Every structure is written in C-alpha cells, then in structure tokens.
Paper text:
Like most other family members, the muscle-type ACh receptor is a heteropentamer composed of subunits having similar or identical amino acid sequences arranged in a ring around a narrow membrane pore. ACh binds to αγ and αδ at the interface with neighbouring γ and δ subunits, and the pore-lining helices of the closed channel make a hydrophobic constriction in the membrane, which functions as the gate. Here, we investigate the structural mechanism of ACh-receptor gating by propelling ACh-containing spray droplets onto postsynaptic membrane vesicles lying within a thin aqueous film and then trapping the reaction by rapid freezing.
We find that the structure from the closed-class tubes has a similar loop-C conformation (left and middle), the same pore profile and the same pore cross section as the structure from the unexposed tubes. In the closed-channel structure, the M2 helices composing the inner ring bend inward and come together near the middle of the membrane, creating a hydrophobic constriction, believed to function as the gate of the channel. In the closed-channel configuration, αγM2 bows inward toward the gate (orange bar), whereas in the open-channel configuration, it follows a straight line (indicated by the broken line). The δM2 helix also bows slightly inward toward the gate in the closed-channel configuration but straightens predominantly in a tangential direction when the channel opens (see below). The diameter of the closed pore is about 6 Å at the assumed level of the gate (orange bar), where the lumen is both constricted and completely encircled by hydrophobic side chains.
Residue numbers in the entry:
A (entry chain B): 1 to 164, 174 to 312, 403 to 469
B (entry chain C): 1 to 162, 178 to 320, 421 to 484
C (entry chain D), E (entry chain A): 1 to 306, 374 to 437
D (entry chain E): 1 to 164, 172 to 314, 414 to 476
C-alpha cells in the first residue's frame, strides 16, 4: 500500500537498464568485493589450473532505489533479482581460464537506504602460478588477478575484505597438502589508463606423505640388491653366472622406475628436484654396478725302466697342477676383500648423501614461508 | 467455456499476479514451503575427489494465495497445469552439495492446485562434494551429509520443512547403501542476529566393497608367499643349482613389484585407508626380507656354498691329504642342520602368515559385532 | 486468393500455445507411436550406452483442426511447422541419458481434417540393461521402457501397434547378433498412490555378442603355453640334464601369463563381463602353476640325485670299488623309471582338464547356440 | 532515391515462412554443391568423420527483383540470414552431428531473385571403411545429404561435378589419399519403401591410404625376429653342448618379444578401424615361426643321453680303461649330430618358404593394386 | 541532464543498427584489423591446435557519429555497446579452429564526432600447419591467413596495420622456441571473376623446438648400452665360460630397448616430427641390433669349441698322447690372436658408426647453433 503504486511506478519510470550506477565523471560507485571460499576441488598441479568455489559477495549503494513509507519502512529488506545493473564481469588476469557458474544473475539483498548485498557461491575455472615450482619443500607463490573485462576503473572503485582473509580459512581437508596463507593486493598498472585486476598470493604448501615412503624402499631395497651384488663376489666368487642375473635384474628395476616417473609427472610435473638427483643416484648405481662388473672380468685366465713310466706318471699330474695352480695365483681374492671395503666406502657414502640432501630438502628449504 | 477464455483473461497470471512481486500477503512471516527429496539414481561414485553424481526428484510445495479459484476455474477443474514461466520458481540450492549446478530441475512442468497450492517435482542430474576423506574407507564407510533449500531468502521471506535411499539405488555400485535419515531445520548463524532459511538435511550412511578385488588380489598373496616359502624348500631338495636359485629370486622379485603397482592405481582412484595398506606392504616386505635372507643363508658357505713303493706313496700322500680337503666340503654340508633350516622357515611363515589373518580376525570379531 | 488471408489470419488470431489440446476429463490425448530404428552408430560395452536413431512416429489429433472449403479447400493436407503444437516430453525411463536430437523446429503433417503425424529422425544416447550378464551364453534382453514423463494416466495416453523384430535394421557389422525383439504396451498405476500414472512402450532387446577376434587370440597363447607345459613334463625324461633349465622356464612361463592377465584387467575392466567367465581361465591357469608346483618340487625330489707293491695296486682299485657302490646310491635315486610315470601321471591329467577347458568352452556354446 | 520508401513498401507485404511459390503443386528449384576443405577426423574402426564443407547453397526467389532504388542501385545484396526461408542441411548419408557455424551467415540476393550462400561447416558423419577399405582397391565413401526438412514436392536440389576432387583440400595428415570423387543428384525411393520423395546429394570418395610409418615398425622387428631364429637355427652348428639351455633362454626371450609385438598392433586396429588382411600375415606368420621354433628344441632334446698279484690288478684296471672307453664311446655314437647339421637346412628352406610365402603374398597385395 | 531526454530519444529513433555505414557508392566500409596476441594458453602438436589470447583491434568509421552540445555536450565521446553496430565476420582462413572467445556483445568508444574502435579481449581456438617439418630444430613457418569472411572488396575491405614479434607475449612455458614472425598484407582478386574481392592478413610463425630434458634421458641408456655392447666384446675374449651367461643379456637388453620405444613413439604419435628425424634413431638403434646378433652369433661361431710291464705303460702313455692331440684341438679352436681382431675390427666400426651418429647430431647442430 502506502503510496505503493506511486513509489513502485516512479522508480521503474526514472531507473535506466542500460546504464552505469554512476552520475557523470567523479568518484564513481565504491563497490565492495570479497569472496569467502567454499572449498577447492582440483588442483591440476601439472598444468597449473585451479577449479575452486566461493561466494562473490558484491555490495555498493543505489541512490536511485531509495524507498519511502511501504517498501522502505514497510519492509526495509526485500529480495530482487539482478539484470538491473552493472554486474561484475570479472576475469582473472592469469586465471579465468573459462566462464562463471552461479556467479552472476542470481537474486540480491537490497537494503532500504539502498545498500546492496549479493551473495552467490560459484565454481570457476582458473590457472595460477604454481609453475614448475610447486614441489620444492620451500614451495611457491602465485598471482591471482580478478577484474572485469571491457571496464577500466574510471566509473567505479574496487575494495577488499580481510588480509590475514587467509587461504587456509577453507583450505580443502581432503588434502594430502596444505596452506601457508593468501595475500591480497589491489593494483593499478599504469601501462594502461585502465585501472585493472587485484593480485592474490599463493604461498601454498604441498605435504602429502604417503608414497614417498615406499619410494624409500626402492632406494634402500635397491641398495640391498646393490650391497648384495658387491657382497656376493667375496662370498661365493662363483657368483660367475648368478651375478649377471643380479644386474639384468638390478637394471630392469631401475628402468621400470623410469616407467612410472613419466606417468606420475602426468597429472602433476615440475621440478625434477627428486627425480634430478635420484636420476644421479641412478647413474651412480649404474656405473658402480658395471665397473664392479669390470672388477669381475678381471682374471686373464680365470675371467729301473720300471721307474721311467712312474716318471711319466709323476710328471703327468704334477705338470698340470702347477699350471692350474697358476690359475689359483691368478684369482686369489685380494680384490674381493679390498673392494668389498671399497664397497664399504662407495655404498656407505653415496647412501648417506642423497639421504642427506633429502634430509636437508625437507628440513632446510621449508622456513622461508614469510 | 463458461466465461473460460475471458476468465483466464480475468486473472491474467502475469498481469493480475505480480511476477516481479512475491505474493507473501505483504510483509509478514513468509509463504510456507516444503521440499521432498527422492533419489531417482546414483550413477557415479568417486572416492578420489569426494564427488557423487546422482539424480533426484525435486518434490516441492508452496501455496500461491492468488491461485485460489472459483467455479469456472477451481471447480471447472480442481486440478490444472501451468509451465515454469507462469510460475515464480525458487532457486533451491544444494547448499553444501551443488558443487555442480542443477540440471533439468530448472523451470520444467509444474502442478497447479485449485486454490493456490502449487506442486513442482521433476528430475535433478547433480554433482556433489560429499565428506569422503581417507576415513570413508574403514568398513563403516561413514555417513554422507547433504542440505537442500531455497538459498537466498531468510526466516521472513522463506520456510522449508520436509524417503530412503535404496528406492532407486544403482545396483552396479561397488558399494552398499545401509541407511538414510531425513530431517529439516532452519538456522541463524554467527554473523546474522536473526534466524532464517530452512533446509532439507539428508544423511546417507553407506558401505562398499566389491567381491571381485578379493578374488584376484588374495590369489597372489598366497601364490607369492608360497614362492618365498618354496624358495627355502628348494635349497634342501638341491641347493647346489646355484645360478638357477638365483633366477628364481630375480623372477619372484619382479613379479611382486608390478603387482603392487596396479594396486596404488586403483589407489589414486580412491584414497586408501591406512588399516589395510599396511598389512599388505608390511608383509610382502616380510617375503622381500626372506628373499634377501634367502640370499646369504643360501650361498653363505666358503666351499659348500720298496722304491716303486716310494712313488705310489707320493700318490697315497696326495690321496689322504686332499682327502682332508674333499671332506672340508662335506663339513660344509651341514645336514643335521637341514630339517632345522626348513623347520625354522616353517616356524616364522606360521608366525607371520598367522599374524596377518590373526589381524584379519581382531578386526573380524568387531564388524560381526 | 481463396480467402487467402482471411483463412491463415483467422487461424493464428484464435490460436494459443499456453493451452495444450485437451478434450474434457477423458481418454487423454490419443497418442500413437511406433518405431523406425535404422541405425546404431555407437554403443558401448563398458557403460552399456547406445546412441542410435529412431524416427519417433507420432500420431494423434486435435478437433480444432477440422476444416471446410476455406482450408481443406485450399490444399487438402498441408504440413504445418512444428511450433504451434503442444509436444509430449517423451523419455526413456531406465535410460534418458539426454536430449532427443533434432526435434525442435520441424515439419508437422496436417490434413484438411486433422489427421496428424510427424516421424522425427531422433538420434540420442541411451542407457539400459545388459549388465555383467548380457554377453553370456544364455543371453540378455535389455529392457527399455518409454513414455510421457510427469503426467499420469488421468490426463494423457500413448499406445503400441505392432510387433516388429530387432533384426529388422540390426547393425550388420556387429561383433554381435540379435535373436529377437518385442515391444508391448501398458499403463502403470501403483499400489502407492491411488493415481493413474503414465502409459509406456517397453522394448526388450534380445541378442548375444562377442566378436571372435578376441577369441582367436585368447586360445593361441593357451595352446602355446600348454605346449610349454607339455614340454615342462617331457623334458626331465628326454633331457633331465637341463633341470635348472626347467626351472628357468617356469620363472619364464609364469611371468608371461601373469603378464597376459595384466592385459586382461585393463581390457576386461574396459569391456565388462560376468566374472563367471574368467573362473574358466582361473583354475586352468592356476593349474599350470599348481602342476609345476608339484611336478618340479617333485622333480627335485631326491636327496642325492635331485708282496706289498701288489697291496697299494689293491689300496688303489680298492679306492675305486668302495666309492663305486656309494655313487650307486645317488643314481639309485634317479631311476629314470618314475619320471615316465609323472608325465603319464599328469599328461592324462592335462589331456583331461585340457578337455575340461574344451568342455566348459564348448558346453557353454552348446548352451549359447540354444 | 525512394531508398526509404521502397524498402518500406514491400516490408509491408513481405512474407517470412511462405516459400516463393507460383502455386503449391510445383515446388521451388534449388542449387547446391560442396567443396571439402577439411577432413578433420578419420575414425575408421568406428567409421565416422568430421569435415569443413563449403555448403554451396543456391535457389531462386523473385519475391524481390527490384526497381530504380534497389535492383538498379546495386545488382548485388546483403540482407539478413534471419530474413526468410533457410535450408537445414544434413547427410542422410553421414550427418551425424547437427551443423556447425554453417548457418546464421550472410546469404546473397541478386537484385532479381538469384540467390547464393556458401558457408563453412565442421560436423560429424560416418563413412564406409569397415574391414576392407585399407586395401589398395578403394571402397568408395558414399555420403548423400539433403535438407532434412521437407520432401521434394516443394524442394528439388541440383548438382555438379560427378566426374572431376578430393585432394583439393584433403588432409596432409592423412596416411591416406583420394583418387576419385563423384557427385550425383537423386530421387527418393529406397529399400525401406518410403514415398514423398526427398531429393539428395550423393558423394562418392574412393580413397587410398597406407603411407606406413609403422610398417617398418612391424617390418624390422619381425625381420630381426626371423634372423633371430636363423641364429637359433645356424648358431647350433657353431655352438658347443652347453647350448641346449642357451637356446631355451632365447625361447623365453623370443616370445617375450613376440607378445610385446602382439600387444602393440592389436591395440592399433581397435583405436582405429579394422581389416583382416594385413592383420593376418602378422599373427599367423608369427605363429608358424613359433611353431617350428619350439619344435626345434624338441629336436635337440630327443636323444637318450646326448640330450702275479701285479697282473691281477693291472688286469682289472686296463679293463676299466677300455671297457669304460666303450661306454664313453656310447656318448660318441649317440651325439653324432646327423640331426643337427641337417636341422640347419631343415629350418633353412622352411624359413625361406615361410618368408617367401608371406612377403611374396604381401608382394602380391602390392603387385595386383600395382 | 544537459539535453538529457531529448538526447536519448532522438538517437534511438533515427538509428538502424542492422544497417552498415554505407555512404554512397565508394569506399565501401574501410575497416582495419590489428591482432595483438596478449599471450598463449596451450598448443598441441599432434592436432595443430592452439588456444591463444588476442585483443582484436577493429577500426572503422561512421561520419554519422559526429556531434554538438546535445551529444558531445552531454558527455564527450562515450561508451556504446556493440550490438547497434555492423560487425564483420572475421575468419582465420587456414586457422579458424573455431569461434572468437567473448566477442559477443562487448563495448566500443564513439566520439561526439565518431571515431570508432572495437577492441575486445579475445582468446580462441586455432588451427595451423605444423607439417612433418615443424619439430625441426630448423622450424616450419605456420602460415596463418586472416580477413573478411563473406565480403568482397566493394562491399567491404579488411586491412592491416601491424608487424610485431611472436615472442612479444610468447608463453614462457613453451617447451619450444621462436625464430621470428612477420605478417604482410594482400588483396585477393580472382581470374574467375573481373571483380575485386576482399583483403587478408597473412601470419607466418617461424619457430623451432625442444626443452633439452627429453634429450638426455633417451641418449643415456644408449651410452649405457654402449658399455653392454662393449662388454659383449670384452666378456667373451676374456672368458667364454659364461657364454650362455650373456645369452641372458641379449634377452634382458633388447627388450629394454623395446620398452624405450613405447615411450617415444607415443610421443611420436602424440606429436608428428619430421619423419626423417626418426631414421636417426632408426638405423642407430638398429645398429645396436645388427651388432649384437652378429657379435654374439660370431662369439658363438666355432666347430668345437665356441719288461712287458713297460709296454703296458706305452699303450697307456700312447693313450695320453693322442688325447693330448685332441685337447689341443679344441683349445686350437678358441684362439686369442683374433678375438683381438674383432675387438678392433668393430671398435673402429663403432667409432665409424659412432661418428656417423655424431654426423647428423653435429650437422644440424652446425645449423641449429645458428
């Protein structure tokens, strides 16, 4: 009622559809943007794409909707669709790899002296700077820049929420990973008369400790075989054949490893860091296996009248036994002892080194998250 | 036709009804809305990324006080149809499970009652972000929570009050649906001073576990084990076959490894419990240790691993002497050690093999509970 | 011309599209149908999906469509655009995967009378039964039901006319084959609700599948690996001097089908089947294992075999005679007799569960065929 | 120049939905033709393709020859798509995916009724190429397309170029090739008994393929493999006696390689089409190598075992010498390899023959289409 | 406002949107293109497809947009959305891989005089030659033509403005690398018709490949193999006791080489690279092949080998003599003067070959470097 007809009709008589919520070149309208996040569903760590979901809270004031006795004082708060206005078209500078879902054209909260609240949850396809710098334990940062897409801040100003809001306010629980924090910095690239985007930081932390574990097994286990093939020579020298079997087997193993590395980088690649050295630790148990092989190689041989016949007998056996006695001299086992304690050094040392670097990688390059 | 033409002109819907105005009898409480949830189908379950694609019958009820008719409307036909446009439509929001917008549950055929009440109930192909975690894998396999309702409005603008489950469950789920609680509510929050919007809260408690993994997965376990278990048997029946004893452990080794390979593949599909995974890999370890044992203990040994007269006395000297040697080899035989060896194999395959299914049982006593 | 404008204009003036064409509280809108399926472009296997065309032949009438010399006059039977009409929202209840393709915007058969049809070359994706037990040797009948959606009995009505077969227009290059297809009508009211809900046509597709291409290569490695197992047993009698060799070939043999089965879980998983069928290859394969288990365990079986100048000439031939009966004691283990036994033993055992595998094989198909 | 007044005149009277029809019993004359520009996906197992077709559309409508202000201002014209009668095209034949960007484009009116429009369209379709069309003799792709709309008693299409092609704008990223391209205009009356005749447009496309890359993929392994069993066959007359087992190892080796080939290429003609022909020489040339291969071992398995007190004692000993000699002698007689030498030539010619029989026949399916 | 209502109503009334700025018969519409690829998101070799960032700078001019104090007075030049305008159908000839992204319904800036620019922030799907010859180290120039789709030179004309580098905004996350790119204009008149057709912008992308990580992994096995090969020579001459030992190796390795192959040919299949690139890996890798196969068959090669008490002593001594003969026979069979021969005979071959291998490496390393 109370001058219902009259308010209702004047309003839709002087509002304009096609127009900008600003009166000429000032000031413009100070719109409020602030998104509380819902959860994130997929981090395409490989490609650096981000599919999350949040609420685009927008809110400014409309002095063209000031009400009177019955929709002002009648009911100070009323829900009204959009369509009517200036909506945030926003793209993400890096990201906005793709449209909006549940973001725009959903009803709004219109307060009486014109305050506008619009509270929509949405899914959005983004792609941030994760890079090939999202595996070091030190992890890395990112730019997330939101802003419209033909509008040049000149009839409106954008302003934020919190700053401390964090990013682990709604970090996904399901994560085998983690959150150090999300910054928010408003900026105005001068390159452009257009006032643009806002840069949101990604100091993300990625701790999924599940399979690196049994990845540990192959490095240690594989040392097993190692130690094993270098322990077998002064253990049963006649390791002869067998030994070959050790390394067909030691090699294939490390090669299949080479099978899964690619396959794992499928979803997910970056920084050979891991890779990089276990590659070196690769080549290492490559060339040590083999030269020991060499080791083995080694051996240039190995790898009255009555009394006249007796004679002939005496000579037969003693004659070739010094020849085969030779071969004994030629393969005595001086090497076995000495290189199984080279095998001591080589293994004992190269073992506790990538142990180390991995030791140091987790513990050392972690801190600088601030 | 009783003034029909004319009367659906009289009332107008669009022209007499304010499309743009929510006929809530002006500023009061609300018009009183009720939602009904009936799943029509569940097509896909993801363990991975806690996501379910399911179809729901979006059974909705609210009164349209303007829709109260008279003789050549009400009574002419106590029941009639009117599409979505002639129809204010809420946006019922899958408030914590519409992590994928609603399809073919937007603006479709509605049922027009004879004195405003209206009934709109079609199909919803939807996606949901249900509370998976790595804990929805113990046998319980948790309770899936979901809330439905008209998202925007408050307690002064809306109010929604309120069926199993296996009504139309997917039988070619690898899971099992045990139950199915439904109870509405309304709720004010922290920042708001003022209760509002009401919702359909439906918890789904389920369970799942094929009967197909069991078959090819246990198969290898025993298989495998018995090879580690035979390994050691063969070193008696003949442990001189040195090279070919060797071939077996390469062989047994590589077999064991890929098999576990296709295991974390389904394991990525679906983040696996710590309960089950340990038993498998703590115990194929079991074997690995033995194969490495198998090793040293299999090849650990050094070697086992009267003038006329004057002349043939040289040979009977050579004779005895290396007889010491020759026997230095049988020394090594260690054959009263035999039965021990393989009896000392038996003991620990029994202590492990059991320790497992022993663990199998200390968890197989509570669930049968 | 012949009321040219007076007749078309009047028709659209007193024409409406909010209203459906309902005639009193009655017989519902007499909806006719029946099939014209001529192509099945794609269908899967794994997800039992079917994207076919069928021209939906619909037939019904609207009295308002009756005419005089000013419209029948004109040209008898003219064909209206689709637009004008209240179309039924048809759908595959236990299917519906989407979307009827190419129904909007069409052609509609009118008669001066009213007779009306429109057979629309609808192509769509489907989902119906089959399951694990579709490809059996006793077959399955995918149940497909179709009918209006949201509308019960009390309002609306469709009906079938006719038996026509499946193999009518079955895909000729089918890795596969139909036997028969039936469609009968019905109306399904429930004891739930006292309310007459909708009418529907239910198809049933009866057909057996499987290419043979998979078959020619399943069989192959079977036979061939049975060869090797057959050699696994003959070996030891013709060539026991390769005992270690027969071990190698077990390590060999086994890893090879173990690998065969990798394929399978990839492909099976990928092209679905009642696990009931693998249980064949199961035991038959585990058999070769179970049989080299006992035959080479057996094979290894056996502990052993797996004057005074006149005096020393006697100390020496003695040396030879004592040993000689001793060695007799390891040979005493490997009689070269009971080797012929164990291959006879198991030759027959493998001739018989060979005929076994040919058994369930052919049994199955003596049941297929029927 | 009456610019305004002529426009506005006939737009008074202008008719949309009405075809420019003398009368209703003769239909309109329509011109069409297609120039291929893009053959995007050739999925021949599934025989479907995607092509950018230049839809040459032409027809006549003198509802618009013009006067002074328009014919004569400009013989040429450009006025909107949405402004009348427009043809929905589709390949009876193939049109599997409603059209892309091939409507809502800019048509062409002459000032007198000549009408031309071209557009480009990417869509799906489904050609021959079932288990054949891989040979050297090509199976002609026959696609007929026409308006999917009305039938020939108001519409009637024209044509082209039945003779002349193809590789105007053929895909370079074919491992195929075209060698003719026919084009015919036809009447409706099919197998199925359908009247009310809808004209159409037949598109024959006999094309070639098989610019093989994989070929030698295929080629080299299996030459290598034949050679590899020629090593198995002549390497024995050089080899020592420890080569029995030797040989076996290679057996393991031999098929490990074998089925790794058999996994390869089976996969290939699933992912894309199927034809038996080529397929067959492979797995059966493959089989028969297998065949004689193991039979070989069986051949060097065969053969039983080849696989005065003074004087007293000097009596017995000199016996054991020449006695046992007759023993060791056993081994001599027994492993007089008459079988091995000959087994070289056995497989030699045999190997030849298999080689020949195969490549020679792949020489023919090359030499008849030569 | 300054003229506020009389402003707005005047301008709608006498303005036809549809209508394209046609000002007597002359200049047609002079409209220029100017693409500035802001950055690129992704590209696919296999399927020469790229998703890129383009800001389309579109210019043209409507003298009917100049103004007085009743349009300019009001607000200078302003922001007018698209819609009202006449929009050319721009189209990448040999690209156009589809529809321009977010093109529709954007804004532009008019003058109270008239100067119009339309410069929307596009990102779209492209299509370009790559050929066999792209993943050259030398690169291929992606030929990309742009211009007016269905309008000639009389009706209208697309012109250029701009040469500009490709590496202006090249994705830093390319695996790849640019050489340069240039774009010149051209007008296409046809011998068909005596008429003057529309105008085109032709792009030329000249870039070469390869992030060097690939490189490395694949070649190192190959040095690895070098040493096996190197053993294959060294093992045998320095002891042919474990000949079957090696046999092993022949198997275990060639299969490794097979597995490498699956890996890179996928990528080869994933990405077509000029085929004559593959012959490299071809004969190289296949050398390893012939090498093996001969070295190890030959390694095999060899026939062979790979009183009156007094007169009893001379019957016996004569027995030790002739078998002295015979001993020497077989050792006379594996000499140690010519295995040295094969050592240097093939090792110079391997530095032949090897340096030959290094040939094409080094060659188009003399052209790459440049």
């Amino acid at each position: 009622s109370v001058m219902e007809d009259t308010l209702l009709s004047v309003l839709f008589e002087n509002y304009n559809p096609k127009v900008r919520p600003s009166q000429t070149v000032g000031d413009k309208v100070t719109v409020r943007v602030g998104l509380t996040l819902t959860s994130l569903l997929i981090l395409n760590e490989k490609n650096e794409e981000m599919t999350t979901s949040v609420f685009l809270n927008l809110a400014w004031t409309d002095y063209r909707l000031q009400w009177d006795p019955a929709a002002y004082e009648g009911i100070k708060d009323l829900s009204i669709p959009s369509d009517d206005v200036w909506q945030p078209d926003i793209v993400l500078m890096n990201n906005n790899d793709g449209s909006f879902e549940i973001t725009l054209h959903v009803n709004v909260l219109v307060q009486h002296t014109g305050a506008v609240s619009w509270h929509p949850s949405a899914i959005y396809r983004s792609s941030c700077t994760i890079k090939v710098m999202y595996f070091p334990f030190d992890w890395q940062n990112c730019t997330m820049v939101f802003k419209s897409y033909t509008y040049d801040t000149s009839e409106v100003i954008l302003q934020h929420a919190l700053d401390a809001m964090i990013n682990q306010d709604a970090f996904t629980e399901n994560g085998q990973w983690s959150i150090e924090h999300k910054p928010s910095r408003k900026n105005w690239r001068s390159d452009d008369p257009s006032y643009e985007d806002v840069t949101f930081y990604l100091i993300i932390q990625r701790k999924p400790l599940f399979y690196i574990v049994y990845t540990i097994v192959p490095c240690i286990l594989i040392s097993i075989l190692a130690i094993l093939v270098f322990y077998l020579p002064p253990d049963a020298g006649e390791k002869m054949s067998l030994s070959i079997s050790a390394l067909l087997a030691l090699t294939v193993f490390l090669l299949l490893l080479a099978d899964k590395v690619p396959e794992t980088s499928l979803s997910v690649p970056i920084i050979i860091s891991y890779l990089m050295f276990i590659m070196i630790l690769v080549a290492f148990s490559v060339i040590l296996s083999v030269v020991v092989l060499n080791l083995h190689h080694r051996s240039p041989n190995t790898h009255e009248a009555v009394e006249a016949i007796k004679y002939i007998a005496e000579q037969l056996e003693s004659a070739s036994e010094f020849d085969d006695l030779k071969k004994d001299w030629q393969y005595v086992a001086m090497v076995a002892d000495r290189l199984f304690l080279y095998i001591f050094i080589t293994m004992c040392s190269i073992g506790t080194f990538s142990i180390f670097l991995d030791a140091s990688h987790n513990v050392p390059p972690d801190n600088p998250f601030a | 036709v009783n003034e029909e033409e004319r009367l659906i002109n009289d009332l107008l819907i669009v022209n007499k009804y304010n499309k743009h105005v929510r006929p809530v009898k002006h500023n009061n409480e609300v018009v009183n809305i009720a939602l009904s949830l009936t799943l029509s189908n569940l097509i896909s379950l993801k363990e991975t990324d806690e996501t379910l694609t399911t179809n729901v019958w979006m059974d909705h009820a609210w009164y349209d006080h303007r829709l109260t008719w008279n003789a050549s409307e009400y009574s002419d036909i106590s029941i009639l149809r009117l599409r979505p446009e002639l129809i204010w439509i809420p946006d019922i929001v899958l408030q914590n499970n519409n992590d994928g917008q609603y399809n073919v549950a937007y603006f479709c055929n509605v049922l027009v009652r004879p004195n405003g009440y209206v009934t709109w109930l079609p199909p919803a192909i939807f996606r949901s972000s249900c509370p998976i975690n790595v804990l929805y894998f113990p046998f319980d396999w948790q309770n899936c929570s979901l809330k439905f309702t008209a998202l925007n409005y408050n307690a002064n603008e809306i109010s929604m009050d309120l069926i199993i489950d296996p009504e139309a469950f997917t039988e070619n789920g690898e899971w099992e649906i045990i139950h199915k609680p439904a109870k509405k509510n309304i709720y004010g929050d922290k920042f708001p001073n003022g209760t509002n919007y009401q919702d359909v809260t439906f918890y789904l408690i389920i369970r799942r576990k094929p009967l197909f993994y069991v078959i090819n997965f246990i198969t290898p376990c025993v298989l495998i084990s018995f090879l580690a278990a035979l390994a050691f048997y063969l070193p008696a029946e003949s442990g001189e076959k040195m090279s070919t004893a060797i071939c077996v452990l390469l062989a047994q080794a590589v077999f064991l490894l890929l098999t576990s390979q296709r295991l974390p593949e389904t394991a990525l599909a679906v983040p696996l419990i710590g309960k089950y995974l340990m038993f498998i890999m703590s115990l194929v370890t079991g074997v690995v240790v033995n194969c490495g044992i198998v090793l040293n203990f299999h090849f650990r040994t050094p070697s086992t691993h009267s003038g006329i007269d004057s002349t043939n006395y040289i040979v009977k000297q050579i004779k005895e002497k290396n007889a010491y040697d020759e026997e230095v080899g049988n020394w090594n035989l260690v054959g009263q050690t035999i039965d021990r060896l393989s009896m000392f194999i038996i003991t620990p395959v029994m202590v492990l093999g059991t320790i497992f299914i022993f663990v199998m049982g200390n968890f197989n006593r509570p669930p049968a509970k | 011309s012949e009321h040219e404008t007076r007749l078309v204009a009047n028709l659209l003036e007193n024409y409406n599209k909010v209203i459906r064409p309902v005639e009193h509280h009655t017989h519902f809108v007499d909806i006719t149908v029946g099939l014209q399926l001529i192509q099945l472009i794609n269908v899967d296997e794994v997800n039992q999906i079917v994207e076919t065309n069928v021209r939906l032949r619909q037939q019904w009438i609207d009295v308002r469509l009756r005419w005089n010399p000013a419209d029948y006059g004109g040209i008898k039977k003219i064909r209206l655009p689709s637009d004008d009409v209240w179309l039924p929202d048809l759908v595959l209840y236990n299917n519906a995967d989407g979307d009827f393709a190419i129904v909007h915007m069409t052609k509609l058969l009118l008669d001066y009378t009213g007779k009306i049809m429109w057979t629309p070359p609808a192509i769509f994706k489907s989902y119906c039964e089959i399951i694990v037990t579709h490809f059996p040797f006793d077959q399955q009948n995918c149940t497909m039901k179709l009918g209006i959606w949201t509308y019960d009995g009390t309002k609306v009505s469709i009906s079938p006319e006719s038996d026509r077969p499946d193999l009518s227009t079955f895909m000729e290059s089918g890795e596969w084959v139909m036997k028969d297809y039936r469609g009968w009508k019905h109306w399904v009211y429930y004891t739930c609700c006292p309310d007459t809900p909708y009418l529907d046509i239910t198809y049933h597709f009866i057909m057996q599948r499987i290419p043979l291409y998979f078959v020619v290569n399943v069989i192959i490695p079977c036979l061939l690996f049975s060869f090797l197992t057959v050699l696994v047993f003959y070996l030891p009698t013709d060539s026991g001097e390769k005992m270690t060799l027969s071990i190698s070939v077990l390590l060999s043999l086994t890893v090879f089908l173990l690998v065969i089965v990798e394929l399978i879980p990839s492909t099976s998983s990928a092209v679905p089947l009642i696990g009931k069928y693998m249980l064949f290859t199961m035991i038959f394969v585990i058999s070769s294992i179970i049989v080299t288990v006992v035959v080479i365990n057996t094979h290894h079986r056996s502990p052993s075999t797996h004057s005074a100048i006149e005096g020393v000439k006697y100390i020496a031939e003695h040396m030879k005679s004592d040993e000689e009966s001793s060695n007799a004691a390891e040979e005493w283990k490997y009689v070269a007799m009971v080797i012929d036994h164990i291959l006879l033993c198991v030759f027959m055992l493998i001739c018989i569960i060979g005929t076994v595998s040919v058994f369930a094989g052919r049994l199955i198909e003596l049941s297929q065929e029927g | 120049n009456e610019e305004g007044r002529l426009i506005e005149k006939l737009l008074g009277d202008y008719d949309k939905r009405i075809k420019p029809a003398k009368t209703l019993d003769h239909v309109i004359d329509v011109t069409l033709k297609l120039t291929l520009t893009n053959l995007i996906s050739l999925n021949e197992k599934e025989e479907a393709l995607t092509t950018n077709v230049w839809i040459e559309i032409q027809w006549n409508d003198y509802r618009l020859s013009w006067n002074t202000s328009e014919y004569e201002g400009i013989d040429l014209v450009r006025i909107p798509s949405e402004l009348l009668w427009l043809p929905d095209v589709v390949l009876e034949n193939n049109v599997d995916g409603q059209f892309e960007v091939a409507y809502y484009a800019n048509v062409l009116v002459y000032n007198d009724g000549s009408m031309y429009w071209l557009p480009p369209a990417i869509y799906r379709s489904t050609c021959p190429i079932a288990v054949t069309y891989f040979p050297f003799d090509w199976q002609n792709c026959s696609l007929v397309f026409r308006s999917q709309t009305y039938n020939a008693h108001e519409v009637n299409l024209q044509l082209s170029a039945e003779e002349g092609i193809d590789p105007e704008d053929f895909t370079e990223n074919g491992e195929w090739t075209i060698r003719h391209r026919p084009a015919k205009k036809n009447y409706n009356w099919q197998l199925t008994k359908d009247d009310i005749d809808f004209q159409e447009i037949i598109f024959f496309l006999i094309i070639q393929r098989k610019p093989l890359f994989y070929i030698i993929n295929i080629i080299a392994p299996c030459v290598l493999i034949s050679s590899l069993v020629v090593l198995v066959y002549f390497l024995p007359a050089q080899a020592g006696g420890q080569k029995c087992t030797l040989s076996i190892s290679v057996l393991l080796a031999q098929t490990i390689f074998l089925f790794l080939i058999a996994q390869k290429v089976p996969e290939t003609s699933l992912n894309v089409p199927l034809i038996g022909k080529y397929l067959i020489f492979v797995m059966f040339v493959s089989l028969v190598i297998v065949t004689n291969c193991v039979i070989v071992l069986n051949v060097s398995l065969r053969t039983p075992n080849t696989h005065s007190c003074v004087e007293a004692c000097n009596f017995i000993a000199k016996s054991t010498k020449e006695q046992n000699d007759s023993g060791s002698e056993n081994e001599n007689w027994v492993l007089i390899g008459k079988v091995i030498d000959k087994a070289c030539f056995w497989i030699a010619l045999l190997l030849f023959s298999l080689g020949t029989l195969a490549i020679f026949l792949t020489g023919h399916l090359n030499q008849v289409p030569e």
